[PDB]
Design a protein around this ligand. Structure first.
Ligand SMILES: Cc1cc2nc3c(=O)[nH]c(=O)nc-3n(C[C@H](O)[C@H](O)[C@H](O)COP(=O)(O)O)c2cc1C
Ligand SMILES: Cc1cc2nc3c(=O)[nH]c(=O)nc-3n(C[C@H](O)[C@H](O)[C@H](O)COP(=O)(O)O)c2cc1C
Lengths: 131, 132
């Protein structure tokens, strides 16, 4: 399995896949896939080198950002569900999966983020409960 | 992005990711990530070098197969929602995504599969429609 096949495996992923490096208090993105651009509504040019905190908008009082911050500082994987907002403003429920990985090229730990949209299932459970 | 990061991105994927090659009427597997092992219940040793039609079991009557065979022969991506069964026999709705790709290393057309489990979503919508 070569890097070309691996790259196309990433581009064919249903969930969004991003890679982010740490720059102090903010971890900025260095790679986004096509699934991330359609999920968030942003393009690769306007999403690189910026922390993914913009997806949270002003909904900054969530339990996930705290567990995410603690796990990354300790090199621990974590999975949290966050309420994020697209460029248009639509709110989508994101089952984010962060995995710190060690790049042997520069011996720098990078962070991989898998974004899965579960907003449709959350709306189903709420609608069935109201019935 | 180097090849080590791309491999870690595949191993961290929630959905199952596999790579298969064409061997006539069959399309045997050559790579299986950890997600495909937990989702299908079959180990890498069992699922390798065999076509993925075994997940269908006895439910081989699905119109998605003819659409899959058409897309792979015409080198076109395809997505189908099929009824597959794990090793325990528990049925699960698999949103399969096949993307034919040309490996420049050997000029052989490989096929990338993305298995997404949507079992409960189908159950929830079915429960919603019956209540409506
Ligand atoms: C690789 C990676 C991907 C991330 N993706 C998202 C995301 O899609 N949505 C989100 O709300 N936060 C995401 N985050 C988390 C934020 O970027 C940020 O690091 C986190 O909210 C830290 O909270 P803080 O603002 O208190 O420091 C991601 C983090 C990493 C490292
Ligand atoms: C990479 C790849 C992954 C596949 N994964 C599945 C799968 O998970 N479940 C399934 O029912 N069919 C899967 N298929 C389709 C079957 O392997 C097979 O091609 C299809 O069922 C047609 O079989 P047939 O020739 O007997 O009609 C996959 C095909 C490819 C190329």
């Amino acid at each position: 399995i070569n890097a070309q096949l691996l790259q196309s495996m990433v581009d064919a992923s249903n969930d969004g896949i991003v890679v982010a490096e740490k720059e102090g208090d903010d971890t900025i993105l260095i790679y986004v896939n096509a699934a991330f651009e359609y999920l968030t509504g942003y393009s690769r040019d306007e999403t690189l080198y910026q922390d993914c905190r913009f997806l949270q908008g002003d909904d900054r009082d969530q339990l996930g950002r705290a567990r995410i911050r603690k796990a990354m500082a300790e090199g621990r994987p974590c999975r949290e569900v966050l309420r994020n907002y697209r460029k248009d403003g639509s709110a989508f429920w994101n089952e984010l999966s962060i995995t710190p990985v060690k790049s042997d090229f520069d011996q720098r730990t990078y962070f991989i983020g898998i974004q899965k949209d579960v907003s449709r299932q959350v709306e189903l459970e709420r609608e069935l409960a109201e019935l």
